[PDB]
Design a protein around this ligand. Structure first.
Ligand code: K
Ligand code: K
Ligand code: MG
Ligand code: MG
Ligand code: MG
Ligand code: MG
Ligand code: MG
Ligand code: MG
Ligand code: MG
Ligand code: MG
Ligand code: MG
Ligand code: MG
Ligand code: MG
Ligand code: MG
Ligand code: MG
Ligand code: MG
Ligand code: MG
Ligand code: MG
Ligand code: NA
Ligand code: NA
Ligand code: NA
Lengths: 197, 178, 63, 63, 157, 68
RNA sequence: GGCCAGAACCAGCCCUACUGCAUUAUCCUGUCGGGGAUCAAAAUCCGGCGGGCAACGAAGUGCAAGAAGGGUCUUGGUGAAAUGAGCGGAGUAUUUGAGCUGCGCACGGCGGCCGCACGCACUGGUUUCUUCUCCGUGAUGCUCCAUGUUGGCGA
RNA sequence: AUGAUUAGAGGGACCUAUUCUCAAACUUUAAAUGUGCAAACAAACCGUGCCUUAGCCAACUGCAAGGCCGGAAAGAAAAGAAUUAGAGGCACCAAGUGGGCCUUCUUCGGUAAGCGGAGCAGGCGAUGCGGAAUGAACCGCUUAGGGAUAUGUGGCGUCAAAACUUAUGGGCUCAUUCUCGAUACGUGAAAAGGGUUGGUGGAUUCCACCGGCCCCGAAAAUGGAUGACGCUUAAGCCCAAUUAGUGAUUGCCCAUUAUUCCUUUGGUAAGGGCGGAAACAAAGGAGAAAGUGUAGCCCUUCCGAUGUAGAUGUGGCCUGGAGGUUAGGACGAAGCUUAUGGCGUGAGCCUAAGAUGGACCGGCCUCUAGUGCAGAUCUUGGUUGGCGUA
């Protein structure tokens, strides 16, 4: 026998195949598993890992965030060079708060219809991942992008709301209930807004 | 059989430092089964006599002292052992042997038999070959009379291992089961 | 080469840690002929101490 | 190198011995350590040390 | 059953023999800055701003300085984690800690060596290992032995 | 009936199962909330000025890059 | 024959047989003096002195670095990649120890004069004796399975 | 110092110097083991470098704080000057537990307890295997299923593998109805005393004293227990060996351990191949799937493999119905029977034979549920030993 105390602690849970039933996601996973094995690109590797991920972990992105980050990159980029292709393994959603966007090349798993319309009407084009594999087989001159997940309602509800320094939302159907003892100084006590970590 | 203990001389010293720049060198006789034990006993003596631990000391030399030529001699062994009931008991015993390691190994077996004293509770103070006329005990002195002779009686002469038999015909050497 | 590793190990060379860390821990057989007493120190007639260079006899029977 | 080093040690010892002096040997730099007990009933400190020594199994051996 | 704030502090929160008295002027004059390493040692003669007994003999970083007080961050294990507890004490209960003295000396020595090598000056000679062998030429050589007088002597009466 | 009230016998084993996690580094979570208020107020003024200087520095950097 | 059994070889493992280096001095030997003991001796023992290798297989002391008979029903094979000091070609040599030697330099005494036990550099000289040394095979095989010998039994 | 305490000595008591003894709730002093912090990459150092501030200071180019601009960084020398089967962080959702018990050191209450209560750490619980005859917890070792080799603890007179009763080893020991001894944990003892053979110190063989082994002290109820027999030139005790003063440093026997070989299975797994290479009929063959998972695409390599409560996975097994798709059946469906074979680690599947039966039904993908039995003083039916008995 060999002393391996809690060696099971070092094993890590990693998705190695997709739970998706979508046949086209499976075709894309085939393509990019081949590209990640047979090329030196880090872009292909990360695209493959994201392709096998769960939908919750492929957060959607807004068109406005894409435009803003592409602008921050466009300055300090030589005006000789062309703008990178923005790549998101996920969904692109339209944004009503940004009417005026530049011509952008975007590759996404899916576009919302209004997002696709806005991108095209601004002069850009909507790509799929097979076209991207055709014209950027190693992901040269690309901008890999992720959507936001920290504003999610589930994230806002995580953790006990009655411990000092917590500001999580409680699981409650009635907003007016649970506004008393424990939340006001005049009702016995109030849970502290701040605690030093 | 040859003695189980060897004759060692261990030479060592405290490591020189700022507080002791030329430390004393100590020579230590000891009879031990191997040199690791001999050095362990040397460091025990250094600790309990000179207050020098092995962790701050040096071993300059550890060598076996060869035995002399084998001659039937008288050996005075000055030896001490500890027991819980009586503390330290020192005795001076005499032995017939052919070497100093033989006499000392015999002394150890003797102390083990008649006093239940084990190796690590025994310190040998001095072993010395003495002349016959200085022998004090008659059980040792009887063995150097000029006309010493005795028969070999009540002997159990077992056969050579190859020729040993289980069943033998009563008044022959004819083996039956072997 | 093998003798480079042997030299680094044996002379405690400047790459001692690199060479020993780069090896899998040695997996030996029990000593042919047996031990004396695993529960006692070598000085007490056992096996578990620092036994100086007699470790080479021990390992020869083990290797 | 090995042969020359041993010969130089022999000469140094002979010269020390010939004048009543001694030759203090260099402290050994390398130890070879083999585990001689199984994995049962090991206290936390000894367990941790044996893990850092990479001695996780009986008759495992390291330098 | 009794678990007070100062329970079991009879010998902990006590002056050392013939070392009683109010804190000293050096303590008043020591400057404490945010980021200084300090040892939290309770001064039993003050009894104001005194740390809880747990923090006696702990070292931490200063996070806050007030006109008469010091905020120290102290590591404290509890169950499976160590928290970073911010304690408030008066300045009389902290000492400028020497926990990084050897490291500061090492960095100073490295800067000094760099300057010397830049200037081409003589580097100090290297210390040598005392563990290397060599010839020993003894001054006095004595016999190490047990004698009769040792057993005679270590018996009382 | 009468039974055993307290023991700590297996507890350090449990605590070490997932180990005693070490402390958060001092450069993380170093909130100044609750510290000496005058210094806090002064430091806030300096921080506002430093944010303005960062904005101007980025604007100047954009202009100088566009110059090339 | 895809069954039983026996001998051969091969590859890999596993047991052999064969042992060199260092050390010994509290030691070995001769002779003086003593001391011993019995009829007298010799011996056991102690101090000197002169010599030293106890050298049988010296010693049960430290470390060993010695390549290649018998086991495999404890493995797989019979050349369907024999990668080799082992196969096939070439040469009778190179070079690695052991020797006894050169110059310093290290290394030991007495403070540069000695020595130097074969330390380092010149990969020194020599070779007195001891070794064998040098080339060679991709997969145009992705994988798996298929090849000997002698009887017994099986027509 | 505070408290407790015996006795004398010096100036009935007091004092003065100490002396007999000592404390969980006394202490000057003070370990071992411990316990905080540090040991250069969001840090620290250097520049009296710049900017900022309702901060400090009588002001400041000084102090504080946040930045910016640079320089230097054995990336941590040398002195015994670390090591790692050494990826750190961050979450989310849940189970069972919430009667413990044993041992080692430390212990509190108790005369004590296989008693009661704590500290530290290993265990059993949840775990077998090897060993102590036997034993949850002791010793060894901890576990995929197989071989070889070697060990551990424990052994080597028979039971019982091993000295077919080893040595070319030294001593000691005699014991009569309780059996001397061979009882680690532990499971048969004291105060006290006396055969043999050891020691120390004196006297002229004896005096006292101290060990070893043995003996006495040593009385319970079914017949009985070094495990049994037995053993005494031990097969007992202490010591020490490995074929023995020869010429060197592994006698031997037993594990679910170690090493190694073969097979399985699973990885936080690690690598290759996958663009058919060229040709090639019968009187070298076949395969080669871009793949979590299958009869797993195929090949190579390494490591792990036990487990109660519990969690999770499975081109995992099984049953009644439904949507599909493929079949079968009077040349015999379902059901039922089996020394009835084959396949699968297994749940099970499939064939054969009925000298069975008489009319329905199998496979595969998906859907669905009143879907799997050995036990509940389980429900219903039947049977059954007791019993040719009372
Ligand atoms: K075996
Ligand atoms: K595998
Ligand atoms: Mg054993
Ligand atoms: Mg133990
Ligand atoms: Mg105190
Ligand atoms: Mg309870
Ligand atoms: Mg839970
Ligand atoms: Mg239970
Ligand atoms: Mg048993
Ligand atoms: Mg037998
Ligand atoms: Mg016998
Ligand atoms: Mg028995
Ligand atoms: Mg495996
Ligand atoms: Mg399992
Ligand atoms: Mg279960
Ligand atoms: Mg139904
Ligand atoms: Mg049901
Ligand atoms: Mg059941
Ligand atoms: Na076990
Ligand atoms: Na005997
Ligand atoms: Na049933």
């Amino acid at each position: 026998g060999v002393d391996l105390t809690g060696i099971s602690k070092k094993s890590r849970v990693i998705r190695h195949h997709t739970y998706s039933t979508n046949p086209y996601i499976k075709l894309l996973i085939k393509l990019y598993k081949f590209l990640a094995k047979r090329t030196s690109s880090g872009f292909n590797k990360v695209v493959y890992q994201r392709l096998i991920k769960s939908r919750s972990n492929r957060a959607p992105i807004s068109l406005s965030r894409i435009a803003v980050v592409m602008k921050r990159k466009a300055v300090f980029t030589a005006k000789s060079k062309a703008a990178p292709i923005a790549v998101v393994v996920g969904d692109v959603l339209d944004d009503v708060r940004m009417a005026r966007i530049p011509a952008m090349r975007v590759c996404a798993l899916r576009f919302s219809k209004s997002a696709r319309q806005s991108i095209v009407a601004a002069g850009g084009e909507c790509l799929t991942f097979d076209q991207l594999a055709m014209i950027a087989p190693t992901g040269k001159n690309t901008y890999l992008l992720r959507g936001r997940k920290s504003g999610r309602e589930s994230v806002r509800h995580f953790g006990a709301s009655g411990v000092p320094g917590s500001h999580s939302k409680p699981y409650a159907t009635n907003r007016g209930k649970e506004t008393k003892r424990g939340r006001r100084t005049g009702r016995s006590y109030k849970r502290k807004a701040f605690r030093h970590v | 059989v040859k003695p189980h203990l060897r004759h060692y001389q261990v030479v060592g010293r405290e490591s020189p430092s700022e507080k002791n720049p030329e430390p004393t060198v100590y020579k230590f006789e000891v009879f031990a089964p191997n040199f690791v034990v001999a050095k362990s006993r040397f460091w025990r003596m250094m600790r309990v006599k000179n207050k020098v631990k092995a962790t701050h000391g040096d071993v300059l030399s550890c060598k076996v002292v060869k035995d002399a030529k084998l001659v039937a001699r008288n050996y005075l062994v000055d030896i001490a052992y500890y027991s819980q009931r009586c503390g330290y008991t020192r005795m001076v015993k005499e032995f017939r042997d052919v070497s100093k390691t033989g006499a000392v190994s015999q002394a150890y077996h003797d102390l083990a038999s008649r006093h239940r004293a084990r190796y690590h509770n025994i310190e040998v103070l001095n072993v010395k070959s003495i002349p016959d006329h200085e022998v004090k005990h008659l059980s040792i002195a009887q063995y150097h009379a000029p006309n010493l002779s005795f028969p070999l009686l009540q002997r159990r002469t077992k056969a050579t291992r190859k020729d040993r038999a289980i069943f033998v015909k009563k008044n022959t050497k004819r083996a039956v089961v072997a | 080469c093998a003798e480079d590793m042997v030299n680094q190990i044996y002379t405690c060379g400047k790459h001692f840690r690199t060479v020993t860390h780069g090896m899998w821990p040695f997996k030996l057989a029990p000593p042919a002929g047996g031990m004396r007493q695993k529960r006692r120190h070598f000085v007490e007639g056992g096996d578990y101490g620092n036994r100086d260079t007699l470790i080479n006899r021990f390992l020869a029977r083990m290797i | 190198e090995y042969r020359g080093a041993e010969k130089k040690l022999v000469t140094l010892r002979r010269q020390a011995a010939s004048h009543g002096n001694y030759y203090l040997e260099a402290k050994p730099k390398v130890a070879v350590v083999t585990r001689i007990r199984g994995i049962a009933k090991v206290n936390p400190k000894q367990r941790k040390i044996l893990q850092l020594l990479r001695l996780r199994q009986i008759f495992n051996t390291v330098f | 059953h009794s678990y007070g704030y100062k329970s079991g502090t009879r010998h902990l929160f006590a002056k050392k023999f013939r070392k009683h008295g109010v804190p000293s002027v050096s303590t008043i004059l020591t400057n404490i800055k945010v980021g200084d390493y300090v040892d939290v040692v309770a001064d039993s003669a003050v009894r104001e701003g005194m740390p809880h007994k747990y923090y006696h003999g702990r070292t931490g970083i200063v996070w806050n300085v007030t006109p008469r007080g010091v905020g120290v961050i102290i590591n404290k294990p509890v169950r499976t984690r160590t928290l970073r507890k911010r304690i408030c004490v008066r300045f009389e209960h902290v000492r400028k800690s020497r926990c990084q003295e050897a490291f500061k000396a090492k960095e100073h020595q490295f800067q000094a060596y760099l300057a010397a090598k830049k200037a081409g000056k003589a580097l100090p000679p290297l210390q040598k290992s005392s563990r290397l062998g060599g010839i020993v030429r003894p001054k006095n050589v004595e016999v190490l032995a047990r004698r009769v007088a040792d057993y005679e002597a270590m018996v009382p009466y | 009936a009468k039974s055993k009230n307290h023991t700590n016998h297996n507890q350090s084993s449990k605590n070490h199962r997932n180990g005693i996690k070490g402390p958060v580094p001092l450069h993380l979570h170093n909130s100044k909330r609750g510290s000496w208020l005058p210094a806090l107020v002064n430091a806030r003024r300096v921080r506002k000025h430093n944010q303005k200087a960062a904005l101007k520095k980025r604007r100047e950097r954009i202009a100088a890059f566009a110059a090339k």
